[PDB]
Amino acid sequence: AAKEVVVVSGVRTAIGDFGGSLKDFSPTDLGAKVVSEVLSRANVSGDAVGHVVFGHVVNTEPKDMYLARVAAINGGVAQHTPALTVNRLCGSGLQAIVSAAQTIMLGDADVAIGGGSENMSRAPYTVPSARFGQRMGDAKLVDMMLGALHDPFQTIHMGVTAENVARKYGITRDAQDALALESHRRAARAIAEGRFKDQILPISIRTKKGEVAFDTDEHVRHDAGPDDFTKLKPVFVKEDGTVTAGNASGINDAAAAVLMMSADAARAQGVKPLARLVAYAHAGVDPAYMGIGPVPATQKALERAGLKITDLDVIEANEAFAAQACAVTQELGLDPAKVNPNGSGISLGHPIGATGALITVKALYELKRIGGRYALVTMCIGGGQGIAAIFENI
Amino acid sequence: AAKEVVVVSGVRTAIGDFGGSLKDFSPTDLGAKVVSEVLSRANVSGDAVGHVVFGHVVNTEPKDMYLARVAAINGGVAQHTPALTVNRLCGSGLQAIVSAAQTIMLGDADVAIGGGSENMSRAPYTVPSARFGQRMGDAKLVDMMLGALHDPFQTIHMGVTAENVARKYGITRDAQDALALESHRRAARAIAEGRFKDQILPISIRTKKGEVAFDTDEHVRHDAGPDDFTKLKPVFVKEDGTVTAGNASGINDAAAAVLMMSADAARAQGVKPLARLVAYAHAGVDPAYMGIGPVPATQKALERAGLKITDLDVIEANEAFAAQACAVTQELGLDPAKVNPNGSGISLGHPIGATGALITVKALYELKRIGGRYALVTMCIGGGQGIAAIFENI
Amino acid sequence: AAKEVVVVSGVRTAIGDFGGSLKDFSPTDLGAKVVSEVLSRANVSGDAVGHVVFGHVVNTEPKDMYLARVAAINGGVAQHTPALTVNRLCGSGLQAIVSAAQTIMLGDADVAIGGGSENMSRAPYTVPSARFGQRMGDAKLVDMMLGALHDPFQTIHMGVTAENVARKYGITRDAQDALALESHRRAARAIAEGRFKDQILPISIRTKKGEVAFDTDEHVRHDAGPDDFTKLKPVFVKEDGTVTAGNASGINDAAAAVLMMSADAARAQGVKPLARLVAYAHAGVDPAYMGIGPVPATQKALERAGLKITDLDVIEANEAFAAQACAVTQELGLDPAKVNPNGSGISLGHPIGATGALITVKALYELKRIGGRYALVTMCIGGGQGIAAIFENI
Amino acid sequence: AAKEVVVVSGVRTAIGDFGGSLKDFSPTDLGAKVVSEVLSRANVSGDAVGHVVFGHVVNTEPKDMYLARVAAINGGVAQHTPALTVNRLCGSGLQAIVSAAQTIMLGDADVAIGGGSENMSRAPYTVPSARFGQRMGDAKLVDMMLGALHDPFQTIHMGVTAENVARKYGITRDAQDALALESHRRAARAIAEGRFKDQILPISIRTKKGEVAFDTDEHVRHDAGPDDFTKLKPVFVKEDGTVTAGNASGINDAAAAVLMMSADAARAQGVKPLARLVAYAHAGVDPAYMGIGPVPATQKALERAGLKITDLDVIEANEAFAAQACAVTQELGLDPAKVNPNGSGISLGHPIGATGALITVKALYELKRIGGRYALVTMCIGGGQGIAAIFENI
Ligand SMILES: CC(C)(COP(=O)(O)OP(=O)(O)OC[C@H]1O[C@@H](n2cnc3c(N)ncnc32)[C@H](O)[C@@H]1OP(=O)(O)O)[C@@H](O)C(=O)NCCC(=O)NCCS
Ligand SMILES: CC(C)(COP(=O)(O)OP(=O)(O)OC[C@H]1O[C@@H](n2cnc3c(N)ncnc32)[C@H](O)[C@@H]1OP(=O)(O)O)[C@@H](O)C(=O)NCCC(=O)NCCS
Ligand SMILES: CC(C)(COP(=O)(O)OP(=O)(O)OC[C@H]1O[C@@H](n2cnc3c(N)ncnc32)[C@H](O)[C@@H]1OP(=O)(O)O)[C@@H](O)C(=O)NCCC(=O)NCCS
Ligand SMILES: CC(C)(COP(=O)(O)OP(=O)(O)OC[C@H]1O[C@@H](n2cnc3c(N)ncnc32)[C@H](O)[C@@H]1OP(=O)(O)O)[C@@H](O)C(=O)NCCC(=O)NCCS
């Protein structure tokens, strides 16, 4: 049998807007900041880490091809610790946590860090013709940010797959704008009641008026009213459109990480843990319907966990698009009060490579706030996949 | 305990030169070719795959951020199969195989494909200032290929870290050029004797003279003598250099993959496999001496396998630079006659993300050629890492 | 002897700021607008124009290589009229007027249009490596705007030559900021008293609040006080600097044109002319001291005209930099009250390719306002030249 | 009246192919070479030049906006000499000579240099969105070479306007290919007989094999037969095409210049000159039929010279496309045996901005070869123009 994996500590940055407060912080900078902090929060020496795994999708500079290693080293981890970067698109952050946990499960390590880091503001343009030349004719500057949001098979924006999911599963424009408005309100509540304070690492943003601490998710609209959403126009299809800029998640910058140990190593260190890993699962779906990826992934994870949907006190199911999150809640039969209690992608943002690790942090801190037992963390994946993990508060 | 992992089939493309015969084949195109071919070789249906993992470092286009999923789908793997892309720099190809093997070891899958794909000819240039503009003053087009070959801490070419290793471990220029020459002669002999024919998937390269079959590693110099290497000048340092273009590996394009099954699925199907996985290990080292990463990784892997250096019949240790390949062989006490019996990176090329999977294929087919039992696959990793795996012919 | 050249009509746009009101109007768009207007103001059929010549330096798109022809055709000139684009850097606009006048002097035409057009906001970046490729290493995005402001011989900004002129000719920082402040005030006066109303062609700038007329030179600071200038720091040299962002001309967008006829053709058309051409002259100087180009050019033009500095009632001597305009006024012994009566480059802006034609328009309308006889129009030229023209009110 | 203009000396480079032997020589480098050489040929001191005018269309770098001044200064012309760059598209080279001649005709100078320089291999790509950014979505790298070959009104390649002229003037494919073949044979004969040796300035082209002399127009096919042109397909229209790569001119790199003096300065110095300028003329035509621009220009020039078609011993009418070159010869009634006796754009190449000056040199040296008296130099101009000049051997 495989060893048990304990999550001793976790942290996240505040989520920055596209072109906002974190646009000057590279992904390796953010990665290192969260690495150093989870080491501190867990009281673990950087010399005792067995593995580092980071999720990350859009390379913004050469260093990013070394992201996990740079975040680890500059985060204070000894140079003898291996470092891996993983890309499962929007699930990369949770995948990183899964991969790090596997090294503990398999006995290759008894300490491992799993996280993600992404700065979409710094997403580059590429010139595929620049190495060997165009010779003649106009060439293209390729938007790698928009390219990461396009299905590679039909070359359609991820939002077109959201419309496919809305049409197929019967999700109205009214229903989408409902989830969007509430998400903003739950998040505004969370920021007001301070539910995010402990999990967020503040970052001093060197402004010209003197430094200021960036410690609040800036995508949230605190004045949210339903007219703000009904006035918007569908962005991804010309006819019979329903997905808008308002009911679809933002594009954002952020990083997050968790530190994990084997059950034995955590016992022998007097660390007060957040939770323990119960199970995980992966699934693939039709790429044209990638939004409902979380449904089979969540169902397989419950099977491995020996649990039922009704045992889940906290559900972090990323709101990539209101169109698909409604169908996920509907097809699984979830209690919308237990799903994204404090908002998600629509309100908080979607720093794709980091989202999976970031919402794992949310789920665990929510479990402590409410004294719950089981949390589900799931999200959809461009190209047609889903990923899901279940944690137990302890 | 952990389930035994069987490698039933493997394949690689021939290795194309920089700007050479595969310059027109995208990484996802190459990846799909090898996926479809390992499936046919293992006699496994595209609908029966538990997981796909591909190593890949330098994104050449948006599709590449979906590389594993595009290679799997366009290789004929059903859409219900999860796909993951991993980046551990030059170790990514072998990491992909380890990651895929781990899903079998952990029971999440009984069939998994591990591979790697890289086209360095198609490595792009980025424009960091394109999205938000430069306003005034010259800007830069950033070479992402060279970027992937620069240590991200000191911002020095990997070749400089090769000089550090040569200096520290007493690897003379004469010794480096002797290894480089012997690598070309071994590869030229392997080509002439047809040792690679079975493991190579031909690719039809549309030429204006009509289609021709690309099936021979074109970086190899078949009439090389010692003077061809002595005449070259050091390329990476201005003073006291030893590393030349001739005793450094090439930059290349290729793909490779292997198909793995749980031992029980292999028994039941009645396959005639290549090998079983015995053990694997990772290691981190000083980034400035990344070339000796294989030493601690190989030692940790022999420990886990309960094996000794003398039990190894075949060794594929990638020749990133003769400077480090010599130090690796010297520090572990390996027989140079058993190390890379048919050449390696200096003569065949180094298609970064695919090399680890590619040389695994080479190792297993060489085991079959000599009736050997154990093979070691190991390689150094930029940023200061090593990776190693041991296979048993069965 | 050579025929006499009459200026029957002229016009200019308001001068736009770098990134300001005209950033969406290409140079051929502005060129055509001023072409059509001078035809109207002169009551000349587009079928009766013998030549069109336009000055223009920085190509912003392929069309600009056809600038004179596009401005003429889209401006309403018949397709049988030849069209020439000329580049004498900052003197291009006056050069265009000179070249057009020469066709009348030589009897090749008895109707000709001379003008200039420039949009520095739309100045492009180039990629010299893009046609045949960089192969490897970082390449450069070249700022063609900044490149046009750099001396091609020593590769120094035009402002460094201003410091050379200030040092050599004894122009203090106090003296420079004095001319700068007054220039802004004279211009603010001119805008207030409406002196520019008749010469300016308004351009409707399609805003989202409904269209608005852009008819006022927007570089001018109406609140100008000497502390605004003394607080600034020298921009072009680190030591012993004196040229600042405040005493140096702006970079701007604008177009202007004049319509000219032979004396006979103007007689036989009942056109009420602005002025007639008296003489012109060219000079070259040390490129490192290009600022004092106007001095020898003005002296040679007076010789050809048979006039003295004291016969000039209006002087338009472009204020490229306060450092050089002070030396020009000083070395020629000019009455600063007669020099730039309504401001110049520092206050109004410097749309380089159009400036020469634009300030000719100013000089002629000032001659009418004050009932004067002779006007001088001169300017310095990057690379080390000067150009000057003298007109007579009639 | 106007002063008589004497061409005392002329020179050209050999014409390099696109991406060929002159790809590494900037336009200002080529311009300076010919400037220094016409000075040496005329036996005139660099300090005795009244004006310099250079034709140039496609800026390859910032220096090119200073092209005439850089060519003059680096050609050894004293800095007191004014320098002007002119752009009349393919007519720029001849326009430069006319503009320079006009300063002599008008008395502003007794010595002037007229030339042209273009390196199309070095034509750049622009990035219109680089300065202020693209924010989101793909952008373009704009090919400025192709841009200079597109009519700016209908946005069609010049080759499409060649089809219009072929259609309208009944120029068959057979007739176009007959002209193209004969052009190569005439040029190949001229090379073999050494007719160009005296007029060509060799350029040492630094090769890895050692420096070699570039002194032969390398676009010429010396073993061409009718089948080489009949096999080619139309390149510019999808239906009913006639214009091919074989019967269209090349895109090329070269420079040329001539040195002119007033007749009195030539008398006094005792030079042995090439020719005197007799007359010149311009014309505009329908942009869609720009290929017949030379017809009205040549007619207007013969009128001014008081000459007839039959008085012309030599004719250099640039072969932009055989389609228009045939129509030009047909519409004026020229003897094809006198038109381009040694080839033209189809065989020798078409280095846009330099062609007009280059073929002037060719015309004057051919006059000396046959003891002819009068030469016509004419060419069509994109945008719908023509230019023509007549010279007398003396
Ligand atoms: C939906 C999408 C196309 C919108 O992008 P955008 O237009 O650039 O977003 P912006 O905030 O800059 O502008 C949207 C406009 O809608 C309006 N809007 C958006 N959300 C709103 C809200 N909650 N309330 C009121 N108005 C809103 C804004 O006023 C805004 O107007 P402005 O541009 O004048 O400021 C883009 O965010 C997207 O692609 N989302 C999906 C991302 C994705 O695929 N993630 C991975 C999937 S797993
Ligand atoms: C060393 C390096 C900078 C050379 O770049 P390159 O110029 O593109 O290399 P090429 O093989 O294409 O050609 C180099 C020149 O040396 C010569 N050359 C190459 N191999 C040779 C050999 N075995 N013998 C003699 N000459 C050789 C080539 O002929 C060529 O000369 P030429 O132009 O006259 O034909 C580059 O290959 C490199 O960086 N290698 C290291 C790869 C790496 O970092 N891998 C991962 C690190 S863990
Ligand atoms: C001088 C030069 C380097 C300054 O460029 P710039 O810094 O981009 O100009 P900007 O207006 O954007 O900024 C200048 C700053 O100085 C200050 N400044 C400039 N002029 C000022 C004035 N008249 N009053 C108060 N402040 C002023 C501004 O506040 C401004 O601050 P901000 O950036 O926060 O807004 C540039 O305009 C230049 O090159 N001028 C010469 C052009 C030339 O060579 N022409 C051809 C010669 S023949
Ligand atoms: C026509 C045009 C589009 C062709 O572009 P190109 O492909 O770069 O032309 P190239 O000469 O380099 O080669 C073209 C192909 O035709 C062939 N070719 C060229 N000339 C040939 C000839 N005389 N006979 C047979 N074949 C010929 C080349 O060999 C080559 O084939 P390959 O690749 O197998 O070697 C381009 O030359 C053009 O636009 N010309 C018009 C120029 C112009 O506009 N001047 C100003 C207008 S006023």
Residue numbers in the entry:
A (entry chain A), B (entry chain B), C (entry chain A), D (entry chain B): 6 to 399
Relevant lines from the article:
In 2020, Tan et al. discovered that BktB from Cupriavidus necator is a polyketoacyl-CoA thiolase and demonstrated its activity to produce polyketides, including TAL, through repetitive non-decarboxylative Claisen condensations with acetyl-CoA as both precursor and extension unit in vitro and in vivo in E. coli. One candidate, BktBbr from Burkholderia sp. RF2-non_BP3, exhibits approximately 30-fold higher activity in vitro and supports 30-fold higher TAL titers in Escherichia coli compared to the original enzyme.
Comparing the apo structure with the structures covalently bound by CoA esters, no obvious structural changes were observed. Both acetyl-CoA and butyryl-CoA, acting as starter substrates for TAL and ketoacyl-CoA biosynthesis, respectively, displayed identical protein-ligand interactions: H-bonding between the keto group of substrates with C95 and G387 within the active pocket as well as interactions between the CoA with R226 and S254.
